[PDB]
């Protein structure tokens, strides 16, 4: 009985609720489900017949399978293979399924869904692939944030942004949203959730918010603008919210300048990109990198060139898009930016 053992196995694989666990594992269908909170509703409810004995048999079967997998898993040396074996062992565990399905994945509590555990991480990845990743990809393609900034994306990390400091309200930004200048007045907060097996201690990350749609009237086209640039950020599967708490002033290659779209300049895409650092062998600890702060410019910014220079690989992305409103002038004034231009309504 491998799934009842918790000597070597993490605590997160068990259900933390006692009542739920008891309901799952009983000898007869006597008890009533903890999910149904209301007595009258519990009374009304009737579970399907014979479900218990069969369930128990299924558990035994899959428990045996897990145990067999574990016999292989411990003998394995290479890490990715071992992780895969662990996943195979525990993915069919009812308790872990309960934990994952019916508790929040975004702000996961460590005791319930631990992303340090490989199985839970795999589940989270699968969940991301099912909806959120696809949506992100659609928003990147439709809005034309991929070819315009950075050729392609192979989504690996799930990136979610927030604007907590400006207004007060709590809301994770859906990709391709129209945010007010009040909302995006102060800086955002990232959460880079990584689902691949990666060296947590060594692996650093960079985050770049880029505005491809600021108008350049000499060229009669647009230019990029690095609105916010962080480097050498340390992520951990559970500890992953990039906040002023975590990153230091040394990490900020270009400190947050807010979206201030001009009147009739149009809708401006702000597409955050998340890259992971190149990992160097034969060097213990996190390998930093120095950025030439005079070389990179904010008013015009070759993202692709920058990536080429520092050998980055874009793992994640997110995007919002701002256009002119009444408060952009106020935002500019607060930041000490100039009055802000006004263009002709007609694109002649």
């Amino acid at each position: 009985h491998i799934w009842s053992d918790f000597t070597t196995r993490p605590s997160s694989l068990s259900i933390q609720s006692s009542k739920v666990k008891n309901y799952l594992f009983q000898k007869k269908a006597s008890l009533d489900p903890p999910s149904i909170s209301r007595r009258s509703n519990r009374i009304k409810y009737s579970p399907p017949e014979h479900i218990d004995e069969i369930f128990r048999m299924s558990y035994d079967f899959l428990e045996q399978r897990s145990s067999k997998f574990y016999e292989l898993a411990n003998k394995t040396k290479n890490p990715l293979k071992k992780d895969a074996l662990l996943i195979k062992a525990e993915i069919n565990n009812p308790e872990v399924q309960y934990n994952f399905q019916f508790n929040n994945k975004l702000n996961n509590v460590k005791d319930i869904i631990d992303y340090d555990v490989p199985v839970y991480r795999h589940l989270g990845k699968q969940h991301w692939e099912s909806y959120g990743q696809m949506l992100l990809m659609q928003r990147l393609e439709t809005l034309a944030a991929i070819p315009d900034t950075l050729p392609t994306l192979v989504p690996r990390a799930e990136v979610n942004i927030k604007f907590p400091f400006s207004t007060g309200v709590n809301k994770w930004i859906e990709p391709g949203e129209f945010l007010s200048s009040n909302v995006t007045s102060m800086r955002p907060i990232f959460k880079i959730q990584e689902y691949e097996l990666v060296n947590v201690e060594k692996q650093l990350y960079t985050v770049l918010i880029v505005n491809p749609d600021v108008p350049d009237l000499s060229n009669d086209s647009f230019k990029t603008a690095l609105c916010y640039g962080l480097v050498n950020i340390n992520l951990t599967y559970n500890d992953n919210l990039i906040d002023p708490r975590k990153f230091h002033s040394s990490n900020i290659i270009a400190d947050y300048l807010p979206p201030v779209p001009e009147k009739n300049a149009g809708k401006q895409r702000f597409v955050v990109w998340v890259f992971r650092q190149p990992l160097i062998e034969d060097k213990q600890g996190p390998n930093m990198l120095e950025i030439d702060r005079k070389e990179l410019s904010r008013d015009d910014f070759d993202i692709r060139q920058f990536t080429k220079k520092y050998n980055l690989t874009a793992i994640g992305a997110h995007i919002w898009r701002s256009e002119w409103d009444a408060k952009v002038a106020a935002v500019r004034e607060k930041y000490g930016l100039p009055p802000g231009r006004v263009f002709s309504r007609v694109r002649r």
């Binding site: 799952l24 489900p33 999910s35 149904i36 579970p47 299924s58 899959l62 009812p94 399924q97």
Partner: protein, 113 residues
Amino acid sequence: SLSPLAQRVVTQLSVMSASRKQPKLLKLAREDLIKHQTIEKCWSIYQQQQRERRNLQLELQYKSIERSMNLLQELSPRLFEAANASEKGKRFPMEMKVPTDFPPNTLWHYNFR
């Protein structure tokens, strides 16, 4: 309004139709839903295993046949030729019946023709 034949047709139609004959939807609790999922997944896995076992057995049989026929070809050409014939109109014998739920009164016939 309607004839007796028309009425009977309507009744017949109703027998087939889902109009006011079907129950409520099968709702489950989350724990119950999980239990169901675990039952189904395990079953599916078991079925796959069984399929592989049978498939493997069939492959093994095929390999054995191949091994036999090569040997036959090597040794006795006439015997090999006899073995490897077109069995186009081969018919299973009508005595090899599909096994019933419960057996008959006379289990086995000792005399024939």
